[model samples]
Target: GTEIVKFSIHPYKGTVIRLGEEILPFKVLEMDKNIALVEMAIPVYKDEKEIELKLSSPGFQNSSYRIRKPEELNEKLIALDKEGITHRFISRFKTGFQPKSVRFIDNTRLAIPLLEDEGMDVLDINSGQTVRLSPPEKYKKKLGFVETISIPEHNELWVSQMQANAVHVFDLKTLAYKATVDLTGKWSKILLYDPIRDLVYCSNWISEDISVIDRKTKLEIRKTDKIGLPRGLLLSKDGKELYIAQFSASNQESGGGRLGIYSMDKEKLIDTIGPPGNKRHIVSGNTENKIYVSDMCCSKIEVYDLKEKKVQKSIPVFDKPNTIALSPDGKYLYVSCRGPNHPTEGYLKKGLVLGKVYVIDTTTDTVKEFWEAGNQPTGLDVSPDNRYLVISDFLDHQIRVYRRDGF
Candidate 1:
């Protein structure tokens, strides 16, 4: 087909014609004259019947070296096997231990707290080297039962011990015990440090109050009044407010079935963000400006919009969800859950418990992927580059890792 079909934009190259090449299949590169460049990407013989072309706005892109064309990207995105694993399984690693809470010291390093072992595990992300650190003899018994880990300023790490009723400090660089701050309350809960207030906050479930500990003095300078039997707590970015996730055992109970948002300055409850089912944990996505709650018994994730001061919606998971965390890129939220033997929601059903991890896309606020993890997956964390994901299972007593970046 050698016939020329004509096409033009009112202005200069306003429309893009794709055959992937800069020069289209039809060889109409004429200027100043109303001409036709036709038969593009298609082989045309002499006197081929020319089909006239009209132009519209929606166009396509050609491929490039570094970043692919939008069309090619879309092509790759949908070019999966018969089954797309939520996303795809790149590769994975094994912890061989229950990995509870994981925090990244930097892009290439991370630390994980092992609940059953009551010890800490450090991993060099660059080389896959692992190091286990345990409490030294001096503070061994008191710091037993690890709950949460917090890093505020520098090479110092703060670890909360539930049964010991104290917060222990260590040199993050050397893994040496620094000090332990005895608390006035029982079960020193989720420990988080605030840069704005320069103080550490911990919820006391049995104490029914929030312990405000000073970093230097290692003492509770002030404590907030009853906040249900607060299970897990978080501080707002500005450190002016506190968010606590309370789990209720009964439907009629008001205590654990609610979220308490209080003013740090006034020490009074300001607002409540809810659907507080049997709340497991609360984690915020700094980049997305959203708060994600693991509604255990309710079988959903109440995604809170910090800016809107309300729940955007609830995302039901595959099983009993435990921990909710955000990827470094903030494009996705990953939740570790006790997956049922059968299923529950969205391909999940009711059955015996299994371990699962659900992936949620923050842009669309939808579950994009799911992974069968260790037995009763308890904690979930992601790397700062969003290249790695780590999870721990309670029943299986195993920690798992996955390589999720480019591959």
Candidate 2:
């Protein structure tokens, strides 16, 4: 005997079923013409019967479904007005329509395209903000290369070397190049907030002089001559004098060295001080009366007395010490040694490599510690808070920032 029951069937009505265990979230890949393809991964279980699926949507009058065999579930493409849901899938599966690939070349940078083009929407992985990128009509020109960067007491304002040609002013917060100061010839290096004049001095390596720029105006206020290949520039603690480290002559015979003791007030060339075995860079003591200069040719750090203007001592260093920085409070001097031309027997025996930082004690003026780094370490600077030391490795194409532990 056949029995018939009278009941009304709701086309948009659906049932809600909950899965016992937490499942992986689904990633939406593409959507087109009232269809969306989503990718999701599901865990495999011995009891396939425990798995269940449900699909629902409010727009289509609350449509839902429950099915067995996770893989047997088909893609449910509902109409524009239909609400939809599907569940229980393992590995990768496509639902609705497939999407085009979205290419993001630089992970660290974001590109925004113009309004007319229809590109895939990108969500900021960090902020969860939806973004649309448009292509630019023309690429921006590459500006001057940055050699050195200085962050003063405030973190926002930063000064960078545009070589001897210009000084590039940038805001640290925004990373925007605010202005430029043209020095005519290329500038080699820069030292900030000189105690004597409270100004920024840039060493012009090609011109054999230093360009003094007013930080506020971003203009060269004065230029001092007779400084040969001026690379290392430092100021005394008392703010009485500025030490300019100059290479004697380009030729090997004259001996590449340093000349110290130049006036910041008068912009006058003071008595020449060096010939310290081809000195390349120099740094002055904050409290003590000692001056440290790196002799690239000799691979040593020469110490000089500010008052007597004489060499106090010399400590053996690496192959070529290009830059030096004194820690705040003057306890240590960090020296960047750009090692030898080729790996030698001695370096191989001890497992020593080129490009190392040598830390020297200010009181004894002796090498205290050394650590290996990347190749061609050229510029060095300690953070304003004295927490980390940042060294620029030219050939390595990266900057190494070392955190100071405990001190």
Candidate 3:
């Protein structure tokens, strides 16, 4: 006859097992009558040796194991032991509770662990403190100027370009010039940073390629070729792939806009899905398996199956949509549309400048909401928290931030 003994294990105080590391404020979840699952509250790197589990309250006495899988269980127990008595004691200090999500924001600064939303928020960064400077009226005139702003994160701010050949980097705290990357042959539209690889990708329209740069060295790695007149570049939520919109060359009146897929590991083009009809913009799905691309000429938003590399379906949006952004929860997509006609000189033209934004339901593939925007809405970005959407209006020479209310 076998005697059944029940035991409870509590995690160490202020320590959680995140990514295999023992993080503070350990969390324990009851899995079954006799088993409990433990995890960390913060993220930890792979192969980290900071995590451990131990029995709390009445400790185990004369414990002996019944070998369901002797070899595997023994190895796991040995690892737990190696994490040692210290880890167990720390975990014992914890009360065995779990939090759904953690908030690390305060009056002066905000920090987020996930990449899906804006990574950080510092009040001083966007306090309208930096002196506002406009490009020479000539540059604005020739390029049909749109405003550019800095995004503060990780003690630095990223300066992106709007229909320009250069992107500048500035310090978030000091607001000093860190570097200026010359796009040269390419026209940069959007830029994104990947911390895992410590690199930045510049989405270029003129070259139809993503300019790769090493963040540490502040130098260009090389150009990723054969991307279709690339517009918006979105890194996967997992940071493993890059989704690029291969819109036709600015000059190519026809045959523009397709989805270009690339593998981050290989740093090479893996596949292309298109003729998605003037694919102008793209955003990653909540799950990494799907991507949404905007079709300006066709006035539709096409969903692509990442694994299949095929168009899943096309959802009709507003007229001449130019950009798309996704909420942080990945439940809604914000599509920004330009009016059918360009604005005329002077007097802030009406109908021609009446741009609109549409919110699409990700689960149902239907339009969920719509709102009016300023003239010539060309670019849209969602704040890190998904609480706000920023739209850049070329004719208006300003960027507007819309709070996501009730949705």
Candidate 4:
């Protein structure tokens, strides 16, 4: 039997964590000055189904926690009252212009692809230095409309350019010029990297299709048939399936956002999942059977169950969710909320609200806390170790970095 507990650690900067006499591994996720919200798991017992746990750590006060048995025990929250303190804004980087995507190459380096500037900015969190990369001098006009960024391999950076009808590849390490991958589809928007197959799946907005490109060969492998204005492209963890987030091109279709599941081996659409709303982005949590879709039109997140093929629940947000990122540990889901852009009489009545970054606890599918953002917070990413959260402001042309205190 195994059990997980969330407890407050006093003299919070201690290293060793002990469960009675046995040392246990843990992660410190949040802190309130002197107390930390630490999570630790007890090992599973083979023969014994019952166990009592008393937690202790170096410099920890007399505050000890007790658990009766594994089955009945879960993370016991202690003094997690202060919401905004979990993450603190650490750094801000100015971008070239209209930065749409912000991705962490690792723990320290962040890649921000400029939409209108026709350039990329690689920022180092430690050194506070930035190295900007641009396309071949001749392709500036054709590549300026960059929409999405993806890292298909350790040494490769793939970015989709809408104006060029192609994906420009770059050297991940040196940020040097690589090659251009032409697409069979139009308006290349979202580029999803499938590491297992070494393929880049691009969602062509205007052409309403998906283009499969080979990384090594640098050519379009094939294009899927028209798929309702495909937007977000998500590949299964095992590389066997592809999930396409789509919505009707017009009101005449009498349709909304829906997900098209495709069989990678068969190269065909296998299933369709929907509550049908305007979904902009989709992300998977720790569980394989679940996917979280950010419904832009409805201003909510629809948690869809893959096995059941239905929406398990819809979580409302403060604004339109443009994109989302899940922490490396899969414990938290972060959403970049784009505030109301419509007029007063529109569906969402609120006029001109500042964007925000909403942090959600995956287990409960609830918004744990939110941080105020800029004019338009569109893309975001969490570091590999779940230490830093980086968000891009689409309109303001800036990237804000938030760090979990102790990481």
Candidate 4, 368: how far from true, in Å?
Answer: 0.5
For each of the candidates, give the backbone clash count.
Answer: 18, 21, 22, 2
| Candidate 1 residue spans exceeding 4 A from truth | 1-82, 86-98, 125-128, 136-139, 142-144, 150-152, 249-256, 286-289, 306-309, 340-351
- State each model's C-alpha RMSD to the native: 16.0, 19.7, 20.4, 14.1
Off by over 4 Å in 3: 1-130, 133-153, 161-164, 237-240, 249-253, 265-267, 342-353
Question: Comparing candidate 2 with candidate 4, which one achieves the higher TM-score?
Answer: 4
> How high is the CA lDDT of each candidate model?
0.62, 0.51, 0.52, 0.73
Tens-digit lDDT string for candidate 2 (135-157):
11221122223333334343323
lDDT digits (tens) for residues 1-407 of candidate 3: 12222233321222223222322343454332122444323222234433232222223211222333212222121111112111111111010111001111222222111111111122212342213222334332223111123443455544444345655555656645566566544666566778778777877766767888776666777878656677667787777778877777444556655676788889887777766456776777766577888887787888888778788888887777876777778878878887666435432343443677778888888887665555556556665665555554444433444545543
Q: For each candidate, give its TM-score against the true structure.
A: 0.70, 0.58, 0.59, 0.75
Worst 10 residues of 2 by lDDT: 89-98
Query: CA shift at 336, candidate 2, in angstroms?
Result: 1.0
Greater TM-score among 1 and 2 belongs to 1
Q: Global CA lDDT of candidate 1, please? A: 0.62
Over the stretch 1-407, how does candidate 1's per-residue lDDT look in tens digits? 33233332211233434332333443445332111222233224225433222222222122122222222121111111113443433223344345556666766566666655656677775665877666665545443344555564656787776666777777877877787788887776577777666688887766767788887777779888777666667788787778888766332474355677888788887776665466768888655467888876667888787778777789988667877888877788898887654444432232354566888988778998775554567666777777777666554444556656472
**Number of the top candidate by lDDT?**
4
What TM-score does candidate 1 get on C-alpha atoms?
0.70
lDDT, candidate 3, residue 105? 27
